From a paper:
The EPAS1 gene encodes for the hypoxia-inducible factor 2 alpha (HIF2α), an essential component of the cellular oxygen-sensing pathway in humans. Under oxygenated conditions, HIFα subunits are hydroxylated by prolyl-hydroxylase enzymes (PHDs) at two conserved proline residues within the oxygen-dependent degradation domain (ODD). Hydroxylated HIFα is recognized by the von Hippel-Lindau tumor suppressor protein (pVHL), the substrate receptor of an E3 ubiquitin ligase comprised of Elongin B, Elongin C, Cullin-2, and Rbx1 that polyubiquitylates hydroxylated HIFα subunits targeting them for destruction by the 26S proteasome. Pacak–Zhuang syndrome mutations are concentrated in the HIF2α sequence to the residues in proximity to P531 within the C-terminal ODD (CODD) region.
We crystalized the PHD2/HIF2α-CODD complex in the presence of FeSO4 and NOG to stabilize the interaction and prevent reaction turnover. Well-defined electron density was observed for all 20 amino acids of the HIF2α-CODD peptide allowing for a detailed analysis of the binding interface. The HIF2α-CODD peptide is observed to fit into a cleft in the PHD2 surface with P531 positioned nearby to the coordinated Fe2+ atom in the PHD2 active site and the PHD2 inhibitor NOG is observed to coordinate the Fe2+ atom. The loop containing V241-K244 of PHD2 wraps around the top of the peptide, enclosing HIF2α P531 in the PHD2 active site. Overall HIF2α-CODD binds to PHD2 in a similar manner as HIF1α-CODD (PDB: 5L9B16). The main structural differences in PHD2 between the two structures are localized to the loop containing K244 and the end of the helix around Y403, which are both slightly repositioned relative to the PHD2/HIF1α-CODD complex structure to accommodate the HIF2α-CODD. In our HIF2α-CODD structure, the backbone carbonyl group of the corresponding D525 residue forms a hydrogen bond with the T528 side chain disrupting the helix structure and directing the D525 side chain away from PHD2 K244, not allowing the formation of a salt bridge. The presence of an additional glycine residue (i.e., G537) in the middle of the CODD sequence of HIF2α relative to HIF1α results in a reorganization in the surrounding residues that maintains the side chain interactions previously observed in the PHD2/HIF1α-CODD structure with some altered distances between the corresponding residues to accommodate the additional glycine residue. This adjustment of the positions of side chains results in an overall increase in the distance between the sulfur atom of HIF2α M535 and PHD2 Y403 by 0.6 Å relative to the corresponding HIF1α M568 and PHD2 Y403. There is a sharp increase in atomic B-factor values in residues P534-D539 relative to the rest of the peptide indicating that this segment of the peptide has increased flexibility, likely due to the reduced contact with PHD2.
Residue numbers in the entry:
A (entry chain B): 188 to 406
B (entry chain A): 523 to 542
The structure:
């Protein structure tokens, strides 16, 4: 499937109708495995640190999210396949332009590479972008070979506003997920009992992200 | 109601944003 057809025939209608869109077998097993090695290498070489919160108050970040992460630009040596993933995500989003709600997506974060090190770690119910920080689309790539959610947990459960059913996303190998980052999609990472890896990029709406930067720079 | 930013995943809020 070309990006153009995936974007226009699937991602766009799916995002506009449901606000949550899964693409399985996104890059293929060979590229998926390479990404998984790069992530293992980061993990093994002690690159990960505690996942942080936008606004840190009295409780530890670890009470809220049990993952450890690093940020990847995609050009670092030994991270080139993550960079290919990021370009592939970018390509999809660029082919969606002007058709994802009324968003105009001009930019994104670096990739957040995140590991829940089993042990019942997860992420309490949250909204990625509750207060208008610019993030309009959350994009997650999973790379967990041999994941059995009934035994190892780690389900991403999303509660799409107004819907008769919540969405349970297993963190399955080579699975790509898009969802609106705002309050339409509260979500949680249910406790994980094996090592769970995912790479997240957030896409920014130009106008909202500009306002967010303004509020922050004069906050 | 809770400030939901206290639960939201951190992102760099200036000068780390990749332009597509
Ligand atoms: O890893 C997942 O499935 C979901 N992660 C998050 O919700 C997050 O980090 O904001
Ligand atoms: Fe989240």
């Amino acid at each position: 499937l070309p990006a153009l057809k995936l974007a226009l025939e699937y991602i766009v209608p799916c995002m506009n109708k449901h606000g949550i869109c899964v693409v399985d077998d996104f890059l293929g097993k060979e590229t998926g495995q390479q990404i998984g090695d790069e992530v293992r290498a980061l993990h093994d070489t002690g690159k990960f640190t505690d996942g942080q919160l936008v606004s840190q108050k009295s409780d530890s970040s670890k009470d809220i999210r049990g993952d450890k992460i690093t940020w990847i630009e995609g050009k670092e040596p030994g991270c080139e396949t993550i960079g290919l993933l990021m370009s592939s995500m970018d390509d999809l989003i660029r082919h969606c332009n002007g058709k994802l709600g009324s968003y105009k997506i001009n930019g994104r974060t670096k990739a957040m590479v995140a590991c829940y090190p089993g042990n019942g770690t997860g992420y309490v119910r949250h909204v990625d972008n509750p207060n208008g920080d610019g993030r309009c689309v959350t994009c997650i790539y999973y790379l967990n070979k041999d994941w059995d959610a009934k035994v190892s947990g780690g389900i991403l459960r999303i509660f799409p506003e107004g819907k008769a059913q919540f969405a349970d996303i297993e963190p399955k190998f080579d699975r790509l997920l898009f969802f609106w980052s705002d309050r339409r999609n509260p979500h949680e990472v249910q406790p994980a009992y094996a090592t769970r890896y995912a790479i997240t990029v957030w896409y920014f709406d130009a106008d909202e992200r500009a306002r967010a930067k303004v509020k922050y720079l004069t906050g | 109601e809770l400030d939901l930013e206290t639960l939201a995943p951190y992102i760099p809020m200036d000068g780390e944003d990749f332009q597509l």
